[PDB]
Amino acid sequence: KNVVIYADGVYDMLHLGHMKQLEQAKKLFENTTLIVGVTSDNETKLFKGQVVQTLEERTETLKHIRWVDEIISPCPWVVTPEFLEKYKIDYVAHDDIYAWLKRAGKFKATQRTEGVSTTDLIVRILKNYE
Amino acid sequence: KNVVIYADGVYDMLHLGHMKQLEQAKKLFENTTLIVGVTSDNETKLFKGQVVQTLEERTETLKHIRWVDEIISPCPWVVTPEFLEKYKIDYVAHDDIYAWLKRAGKFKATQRTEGVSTTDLIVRILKNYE
């Protein structure tokens, strides 16, 4: 009955937005194992641009989130069919590179939550000082 | 065998420091229930000074932390013997107003972790721009 779910991301400065997305992946089915992949520093910088916390910092925070069952840290930047087989992953959770996952029935959408983020929060502090 | 532990705080902009403290309270004994009390907006502002996130925001984030079993939100600013009886609390976890708790054997120390905080993190961003 147990379904293995994989979610990957940078998870920099984790906030309610990440946590809700993780909750959503974890609850895609009744009985799941959520594996979270955390991207390496070098590849995030090269491909996405700038990361604020190190790999160890971003991984250690994730360790404290209820929905997270296992962490792969670092994780590959791109998911492969081999990777899914290696870790016996049934579905990849995500918010076309992913065409092959949809074709295989292994693509599960999750949504984002705007406005909740660390960035937005210091704005809040500063509006105080006009 | 189960021990009820109570921890209270503001829990504004939750970071690894709060999470480690929560972990520590949760693991004081083998079998525990960790109850977390989150302080109200009005009383935090009046007594401590400024809060960045609302009561609902600070409580909803805490909901996602592994170690948290129950939340009282808002919680009283000061713990009373009546309060402990009401919620069948065995120990209060904390990092002299608390003399009475020590006297009763109900005071459990937990430690802080410096440098890990949201504030410290935007400093990190800004050192980039000299």
A20 marked ligand binding residue = no
Closest CA to B42 of B34, B51, B33: B51
Around Cβ A27, how many Cβ atoms within 10 Å?
13
Closest CA to B123 of A124, A77, A12, A122: A122
Match 């939750």 to its residue by tokens: B14
Q: What is the dihedral of CA B54, B56, B59, B65, to 10 degrees?
A: -100
How far apart, in whole angstroms, are the C-alpha atoms of residue A66 and residue A22? 9
Which tokens is A122 given? 């210091």
Residues on B contacting A at a C-beta cutoff of 8 Å: 13, 15-16, 19-20, 22-23, 52-53, 57, 60-61, 64-68, 118, 121-122, 124-125
How far apart, in whole angstroms, are the C-alpha atoms of residue A106 and residue A102? 6
Q: How many residues does chain B have?
A: 130
Contact B66 A64 (CB under 8 A): yes
Spatial neighbors of A50 by CB under 8 A, at least 6 apart, are none
Cβ-nearest to B64 among A19, A118, A121: A19
- Is the previous residue joined to B74 through a cis bond, with omega within 30 degrees of 0? yes
Which tokens is A49 given? 């641009």
Residue A65: DSSP 8-state: B
Which tokens is B59 given? 């409580």
Q: Are A117 and A100 in contact (CB under 8 A)?
A: no
Answer left, alpha or beta for residue B73, where phi above 0 means left and psi between -120 and 50 means alpha. beta
Spatial neighbors of B37 by CB under 8 A, at least 6 apart, are B6, B7, B8, B9, B71, B72, B73, B74, B75, B76
Nearest-CA distance A99 → chain B (Å): 31
Q: Report the interhelical angle of A16-26 vs B55-62 (nearest 10°).
A: 40
Distances from the Cα of A125 to the Cα of A119, B51, B88, B123, angstroms: 10, 9, 38, 14
DSSP string, B64-109: TBTT--EEEEEE-SS--HHHHHHTT--EEEE--TTHHHHHTT-EEE
Q: Which domains does chain B have, with CATH numbers?
A: 3-128 (3.40.50.620)
Closest CA to A21 of A124, A82, A108: A108
Resolution in angstrom units: 2.1
- At residue A32, the 3 state secondary structure works out as strand
The strand pair at B70-75 and B32-39 is best described as parallel
